[PDB]
Design a protein around this ligand. Structure first.
Ligand code: CA
Ligand code: CA
Ligand code: CA
Ligand code: ZN
Ligand code: ZN
Length: 169
C-alpha cells in the first residue's frame, strides 16, 4: 500500500459526507446506495464512522461534474480519468468529484459507481496508489470482479489500518 506525504490523516473518527448533486445516469437511490456501500467497506476495517449531512459543509463533499468544474483539474470527457479525490484536510480536502461524461451504472455495463467511489474514498482517507495488483487502491482496479465477488484485499486493510487502527476492541 502507499500512504501520502507527511501522512495527511483525518484527526477525528467521525466524518460527515454530503452528496451535492445527482447524475442523470442513475436513479437517486442507486447513487445513494453505491456511496453508502463504498463508505462501509472502509468502516468495516477501521474505527471510522460516517454520517450524512443534507446541508452545510461535510468533510467529504461528493459531486458529479464535467470538464472544468471549479478546481484546477478539469475532467476530460469520456473515459480515461473517471473521478478524482483530495487527500485528508479542510475545505476541498477529502472531497471527491466524479466525471459525468462517464456512464455511471449499478452493474458492469458502464462505469460502476460503487467501485470507483470506494477507490476514491480510499484517497479521501489517505491511501495513495498501491503496487499490489489485487488491491482496490491499485491504479487499474477498474479491471477487478465486482460483487459477484468483491472483498478488500489484505493490502488495502493493512494500509488503512496503518493509518487509523483496527476496528474498536
Ligand atoms: Ca472537504
Ligand atoms: Ca473522463
Ligand atoms: Ca453521465
Ligand atoms: Zn474536481
Ligand atoms: Zn486512485
Amino acid at each position: 500500500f502507499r500512504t501520502f506525504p507527511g501522512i495527511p490523516k483525518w484527526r477525528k473518527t467521525h466524518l460527515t459526507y454530503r452528496i451535492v448533486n445527482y447524475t442523470p445516469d442513475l436513479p437517486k437511490d442507486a447513487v445513494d446506495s453505491a456511496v453508502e456501500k463504498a463508505l462501509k467497506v472502509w468502516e468495516e476495517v477501521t474505527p471510522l464512522t460516517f454520517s450524512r449531512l443534507y446541508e452545510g459543509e461535510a468533510d467529504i463533499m461528493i459531486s458529479f461534474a464535467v470538464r472544468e468544474h471549479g478546481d484546477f483539474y478539469p475532467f476530460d470527457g469520456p473515459g480515461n480519468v473517471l473521478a478524482h479525490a483530495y487527500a485528508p484536510g479542510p475545505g476541498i480536502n477529502g472531497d471527491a468529484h466524479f466525471d459525468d461524461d462517464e456512464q455511471w451504472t449499478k452493474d458492469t455495463t458502464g462505469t460502476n459507481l460503487f467501485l470507483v467511489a470506494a477507490h476514491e474514498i480510499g484517497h479521501s482517507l489517505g491511501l495513495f496508489h498501491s503496487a499490489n495488483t489485487e488491491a482496490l487502491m491499485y491504479p487499474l482496479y477498474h479491471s477487478l470482479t465486482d460483487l459477484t465477488r468483491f472483498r478488500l484485499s489484505q493490502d488495502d486493510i493493512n494500509g488503512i489500518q496503518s493509518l487509523y487502527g483496527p476496528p474498536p476492541d
